[PDB]
């Protein structure tokens, strides 16, 4: 239950904001890495910071065509509003019944009360299903470093010419 | 599990602000307590001919009785749905869902989610007694408010 640096990624199926599912694989499929977000709580201080950074730096991840996936436990209805109110200009999915953040090992079992919350972690996953790069805080007011993702997320599209 | 006309059973939960919230504590105030039991905030409300994202919660500040809003969504998402609804009460997280477990007010299933609160609407006594229940099995379909607020105000005033 392990995901593992050069292991392949578990996939999944998820329903992102507007109740459209989405496969990591068939993302994978189209030739790009894929950037798995996990965060704790659509709404909460960090979490909006961490996303908003994301946001302003969506210039330097799509020069990698890279794919962005944010999931936390929030409903679809819940992860739509935080879309829209933040302008994120990528898919937000539910793993609303926790199956996800059990097969990347990325959850809290108990946040301020909160039971079984997505620990804030960052995956990078190559085309190949590889991970390429894992980052996994217990403290969520922990951020990733940002530039470095970018920059990891960047050197993979590079590689793959 | 929850019958019209017995005790209500007591719960805390934090509320939008994480500040707990205890039902007797809220009840011990002499007023009636309204609970409203939603499936998810930001989500569509239908009748048989309008479907919208106009959420109505907002009618039972009229109440002469404390009013507190429960879904299983987080306290953050809660505040963002309070503050942008203007709601002047609270809404409580039942996140670990042990409040619709412990009223019967679930779905097993809505959309592929997992237990999801039924709209409900129950009415208690300060007594801690249940004087008002309507549940639905249509996720869709919200109380009618004016009727919430009419049994509201009249169970508030039969309080001797």
Known sequence: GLVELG???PD???PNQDFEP????????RGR????????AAFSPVCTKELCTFRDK???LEK???EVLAISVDSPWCLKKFKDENRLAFNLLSDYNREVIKLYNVYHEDLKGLKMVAKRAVFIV?????????WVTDNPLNEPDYDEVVREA????????
């Open 7 to 9: 292991e392949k990624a």
């Open 12 to 14: 999944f199926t998820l």
């Open 22 to 29: 989405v496969n990591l694989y068939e993302v994978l499929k």
């Open 33 to 40: 890495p894929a950037v798995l977000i996990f965060f704790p």
């Open 58 to 60: 969506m210039a330097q």
């Open 64 to 66: 990698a065509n890279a």
């Open 126 to 134: 190559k085309p190949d299903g590889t991970v390429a790069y894992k």
């Open 154 to 161: 960047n050197k993979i599209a590079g590689e793959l010419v």
